[PDB]
Symmetry: D2
Subunit: 725 residues, 4 copies
């Protein structure tokens, strides 16, 4: 059924977004390999040139019809071909994850910069030339597997390391703290954020009564709520967010020394988030935006890269801060404990089948390896129970490690047997130890510097059996305040806006008031600006609440801001080029040449599909229409010259610019395209953030690419209130 020209089928080379249909990773990049991807070969199933069969291997002659008694007669029970096909269909679905159901994943590899054997015996960190395959799943938290990507939410960032000494799963989030202190409260918190149980509304949103009810009653939540209400809660891409393990864990070296450690991922593409209006509209225009962007970046060669980093605290410093190291609502400011760079992780191939590899993957923070260990963090402690347990229903049984994506690439042998869907056929005469009948194989292995058995660090435990929160955990305001004061003025404004927007959707007014009261214990300016938007007036008492203390003398920590310290990297970003029916090919040449030199992609847009022909006869295929791929999905907009009259009174073309303008994106206007300055009210002598010139050229591209390096035009904020867009 394919067309003549082979163009049903994508080129198996890197291609920019939109240049080719997307494809399964092994067909797209068949030369991209690693030990884990190779090991999946036993279960990869091709298709070309094969006969269509039942699952039992019987060739089907007619896959268009049920078996019936006469061609208008009833379907017959003996049609086993229909019933196998429909049975398999009828049982496709499995329970989605209780939380982080929505997520997107890829393969890649990790390697350390130098050996860490002085601080850890973990084998995967032992040698700068020893590469460890990874599989990474990014996710939201609240919504179902079919909810939208660019919600306001925390994001999950889970890395499965297939090491020589075991699977290590580093199961983190994109903020450095969690909402709650003790795992016992997790069902209460998750139920409060999830859709409400009477009507199962709202999907993918904290903006509802039950969430803000819980928050207002549990001030320990305020720190992660601050991060969620900031632009952290709406990342531009999974490539442009930070990742954190949250908990303090331990590194254990060959000599037995424990060092406390917190884990960080630093996005090498820099930190970048959307703005709210854009993020919310994008949930409607492309609810798959982050899934798509990640797949397309990998297909293009813009591999997501992250630097693993460790905050390291000696054991004797456990009590030296003014917060508890074991409290997952508290961060360790980098001004106090810097992040030591550890290694680099590159994501360089997409999966073959989303369901088989992404939906069935199982990550669990208990999956550690010798050289790592846990602490008493009471959130971390209960997570260790839940991830093994939940897999029993989600993946159908205790043999979930035999599902191909989850399998260790290193040896695994033990005495466990049976369970639903058991794949492994054990030959061992023994299924117990100690045994003589197989000479006690497989055997225990004593702990040691490498290739040793797992032994827990022998932490001293002293206390009575109590259900009690540590007094050291009972402080809730000083870290929210540190985060607040570390944000730029525009970031602070967006935080105020995020709180105001969420609370406006709370139906019960006393709940809004209680949350504003909580804000008054963090920062008066923040409390008042939220109050004003809610038509609430602070009491005298509220205006007099003493600010919480600084965090160990810190008045701000700029590492907590997305933007205070520039780190922008334009490679893999995308520009909309608004075409006309007589495009000046000299502008297009200059634009594409400069974009290509910085790995910035382009999309050619028009008022219909098909082709337009430039002034020099160059035939331009049209990627999408103005309405069909809105400015939400690109980082900047260029309008080349040519026949501007063609698009000058097109409502969609004008709206495209008004939207990109509103959302603080760089805009460049060449030649007569400068006439569009009218729709967005730019001063004749110009505006910082709008690039203009008689033609698109060297200098014009430079100015545009500098603005893109800075991500958005924050100085335009005062001007966007007036535009009706």
């Amino acid at each position: 059924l394919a067309p003549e020209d082979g163009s049903h089928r994508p080129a198996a080379e890197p291609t920019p977004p939109g240049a080719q249909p997307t494809a399964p990773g092994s067909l797209k990049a068949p030369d991209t390999r690693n030990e884990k991807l190779n090991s999946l070969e036993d279960v990869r199933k091709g298709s070309e040139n094969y006969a269509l069969t039942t699952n039992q291997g019987v060739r089907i002659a007619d896959d268009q019809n049920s078996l019936r008694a006469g061609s208008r007669g009833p379907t017959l029970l003996e049609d086993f071909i229909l019933r196998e096909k429909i049975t398999h269909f009828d049982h496709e679905r499995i329970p989605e994850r209780i939380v982080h159901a929505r997520g997107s994943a890829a393969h890649g590899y990790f390697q350390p910069y130098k050996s860490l054997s002085d601080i850890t015996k973990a084998d995967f960190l032992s040698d700068p030339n020893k590469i460890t395959p990874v599989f990474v799943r990014f996710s939201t938290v609240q919504g179902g597997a079919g909810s939208a990507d660019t919600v306001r939410d925390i994001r999950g960032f889970a890395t499965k390391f297939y090491t020589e000494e075991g699977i290590f799963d580093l199961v983190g989030n994109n903020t450095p703290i969690f909402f709650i202190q003790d795992a016992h409260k997790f069902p209460d918190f998750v139920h409060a954020v999830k859709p409400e149980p009477h009507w199962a509304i709202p999907q993918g949103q904290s903006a509802h009564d039950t969430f803000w009810d819980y928050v207002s009653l549990q001030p320990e939540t305020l720190h992660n709520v601050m991060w969620a209400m900031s632009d952290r809660g709406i990342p531009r891409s999974y490539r442009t967010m930070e990742g954190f393990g949250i908990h303090t864990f331990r590194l254990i070296n060959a000599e037995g020394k424990a060092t406390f450690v917190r884990f960080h991922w630093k996005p090498l593409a820099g930190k970048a988030s959307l703005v709210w209006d854009e993020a919310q509209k994008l949930t409607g225009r492309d609810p798959d935006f982050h899934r798509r962007e990640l797949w397309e970046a990998i297909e293009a060669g813009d591999f997501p890269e992250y630097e693993l980093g460790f905050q390291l605290i000696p054991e004797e410093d456990e009590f030296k801060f003014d917060f508890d190291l074991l409290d997952p609502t508290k961060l360790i400011p980098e001004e106090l404990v810097p992040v030591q760079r550890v290694g680099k992780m590159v994501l360089n191939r997409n999966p073959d089948n989303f369901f088989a590899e992404n939906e069935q993957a199982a990550f669990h923070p208990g999956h550690i390896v010798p050289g790592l260990d846990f602490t008493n963090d009471p959130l971390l402690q209960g997570r260790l129970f839940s991830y093994t347990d939940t897999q029993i229903s989600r993946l159908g049984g205790p043999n979930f490690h035999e599902i191909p994506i989850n399998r260790p690439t290193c040896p695994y042998h033990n005495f466990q047997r049976d369970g639903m869907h058991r794949m492994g056929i054990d030959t061992n005469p023994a299924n117990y130890e100690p045994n003589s009948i197989n000479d006690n194989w497989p055997r225990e292995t004593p702990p040691g510097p490498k290739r040793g058995g797992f032994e827990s660090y022998q932490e001293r435990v002293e206390g009575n059996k109590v259900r009690e929160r540590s007094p050291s955990f009972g402080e809730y305001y000083s870290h929210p305040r540190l985060f607040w004061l570390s944000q730029t003025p525009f970031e602070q404004r967006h935080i105020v806006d995020g709180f105001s927007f969420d609370l406006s959707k709370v139906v019960r007014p006393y709940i809004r008031e209680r949350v504003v009261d909580q804000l008054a214990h963090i920062d008066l300016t923040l409390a008042q600006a939220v109050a004003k938007n809610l038509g609430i007036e602070l009491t005298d008492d509220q205006l007099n609440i003493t600010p919480p203390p600084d965090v160990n003398g810190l008045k701000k920590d700029p590492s907590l801001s997305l933007y205070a310290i520039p780190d922008g990297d334009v490679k893999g970003r995308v520009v909309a080029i608004l075409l006309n029916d007589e495009v000046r090919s000299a502008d297009l040449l200059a634009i594409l040449k400069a974009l290509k030199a910085k790995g910035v992609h382009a999309k050619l847009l028009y008022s219909r599909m098909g082709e337009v022909t430039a002034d020099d006869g160059t035939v331009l295929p049209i990627a999408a229409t103005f309405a069909g791929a809105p400015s939400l999905t690109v980082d900047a907009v260029i309008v080349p010259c040519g026949n501007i009259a063609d698009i000058a009174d097109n409502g969609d073309a004008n709206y495209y610019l008004m939207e990109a303008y509103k959302h603080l994106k760089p805009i460049a206007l060449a030649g007569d395209a400068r006439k569009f300055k009218a729709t967005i009210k730019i001063a004749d002598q110009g505006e910082e953030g709008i690039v203009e010139a008689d033609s698109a050229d060297g200098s014009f591209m430079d100015e545009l690419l500098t603005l893109m390096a800075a991500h958005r035009v924050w100085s335009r904020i005062p001007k966007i209130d007036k535009i009706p867009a």
Copy 2:
């Protein structure tokens, strides 16, 4: 931990029963191979020289202890090694089969004698050089997976053929008919025979009210009930029973011609059954006796062999018989339609792990291949729905064909995706057809002579949509009567005893009377004989019920008897040798040499464990004692000469002989061994079936092996009441 002399490890070569501990098939017989066993290699897991790990590949240091706070303190929730191991244990079991839950399985291979391409295009039957791997599971029907082997029950005989054109499952039983006509009634009959629902008694027995209630009210059951009540219901081993597909199926040749077919398996070892007292006793002494016999035969190189046979009826002969070919309560007498030999099956390797290969195996009579097709048999029709449906809970979901033992060895490719425990990772860009994006692969294949798609035979259907039994099925007594008349008089007596014992356990006297009434419609002598064991007296009306008509002129068919035509073979049978402390080592040499020569095994027994020395100094190792390994488990008993004084007086030795005598087993006595005649009341002149002489040979061993070939000494029956055992 293994002993210094290596005596823990079974010899990896053929050894007779009891010589070596039993072992997993690929460790016992590593040189045995077939295409299926080869393709299972990728999931087989070893053990020697490997480290003990978690399922995530983490080496375990201490597999003897939980992690606790202090060595007498509480267990910690962070012990992930304990929770993984306990979790897998906690979820070991899967539902058992609804029916046939009790069964034993082995690998083997099939080969046809000649090409049958003139009558079928089935590829596995197309070439005398085409060898087809098989996996065969034999079973009882009623009991659980943990019930006894030698119960009275029908047996299952299910063969999975891994053909080049698909899995073909031949899912049969050891009797040629079933209890019921229409699949709709299956839950009724099976509930009736199964343990009663209030108290869940009895296990593995039809001897209870509800079974006989149903039978008494559903005369269509009486034919298979006659089989079950005969010695057919207590086979000596799975090697010495017949198998039958029961239903009429079709062979379809390359030209499109349909031929009606009924399937047969002929045991090359001959047909042989236990007697009731033996079979019931063995359920107590060795409830695994048939599973053990199958395993040990294969370990010895005594492979079970069966001949596939076909009864073939041309389409135009569909109505040529007194009974409906579609009626699964009717058999086709071999005297009207002979069985044509088709091929040989040899079962030559045990599995490696019972649960993974046997318990998870899924057979379904709907799994046919091009060259075979169904008919409208209304029991068969219903089955085609059930065996697909049941696997969704039993085996966890729609991907049960990916469980290794179930996998085809030929190619399988299609558009089905997902489902719980999905192993195959599909790389096809398309998961639908028709598609252009993968040029419509995998593709449909037209039907053809070889390697073609499945098309159903275009049988003509005409009639209204009815829930109605065909009147042609409404005859219940002629087949039961043919079966009865074809039995020898000792077989007839055993049938009488079978009904008599079962009905004796029915509490409600009226159910017994109604079953006696049904018997009077079959045969008066059989009815009177059961009535008299039950203290029931036939009425005048019952005494005058006209017998049912013969079956197409036949008043008997000897192929229906176990024994009427000698087919007895001795290879793989076992003789008890009752030792004394001074054995005539010349007797032993001749005995074992004649036994060896015929492939008969020997088991040396004495009054205690350890050893004895013969007349010439030879050390005789003792396998077990008289009391420890009773006669129940052997086929004959030899008592050699020597110091008979040593055990003439022994209660165990005497009992051994009285049990063996009561169970109709051949006995041979040499020299003073003839003293034993007293215990079993033999007269001096000798008795047919008791072998005697001065020395244990000349023709003392030809005589005894001749008795063994005839299986049991039927003539002894009139004398066994006299002996209290």
Copy 3:
């Protein structure tokens, strides 16, 4: 279909073993009540005088045939009555218990002799007039749900107390100790006594290599092994064996004082076991002998009693 005389139906009065067909407890003894049995009334389904229906409440006209095109024709996919009946049958079974799969259970009640409030605040022990419904399941350990009752084995004795302040399950055995010290070894011991993995033999028996391999290498097992090898391993009936919680637990009183406790059940019918040859022969003549004995004792009014 019932006989004219009515002899199909067992009398709703206590009768000795074998005098009447056995029957569902609420039809055999409809006036034996306790609070639990009363609370199950919402889910008990009768049958007499009701029409045969699908599970969706649709009356069935012909429960003897599938729907087919002609009376000798193929079965039609549209027969929802057949498919529902066969679907339910096809999915009847659930996984059996990993251990103690073979067991027999009965309803009853517990009452204390005196208030134990000086040593425990447990509400079901606070007053001798406090009656606590129980459900008790007795079991073997090794064999499947289909295995024989009078095997040599440890027996389970599990009591569910439906108290006014929560379910208390007292999950014990018939000997006062267990085979092993630390729960991490439970899968090793259980795998060793269970049928061996290659061939799944032997059912309901410790008499095999792997069991004795483990015992010989783990001397902590020897105490319970001694009990299993004694006639304790072959009880005459569940009414004539002891029960034990094995572990030391704590009682906590209202003042917060903790007392260590080990739990016992003393059979008021006394202790009695079979002898080996009799037990082993019974596994063949009546593999349901203890299940039968329990059910029939209760039917006769010979109620199992334990202190």
Copy 4:
């Protein structure tokens, strides 16, 4: 059988008939109804064959399929009239 975990999905409260339902079906995962019927099969005499089939009738009768004539060969074939 997968989505709602077994063949007793009709006992999940929202799914329950409000009219009588009785039959010989037993067990299954999540089984809520405790059947007191001495019989779990029909035909039976031990419960006088209850619950009983009901002939079709103008009201409260058993289900019987309309006796449509069926005539043709067993075919996997789209009707030309659908083309």
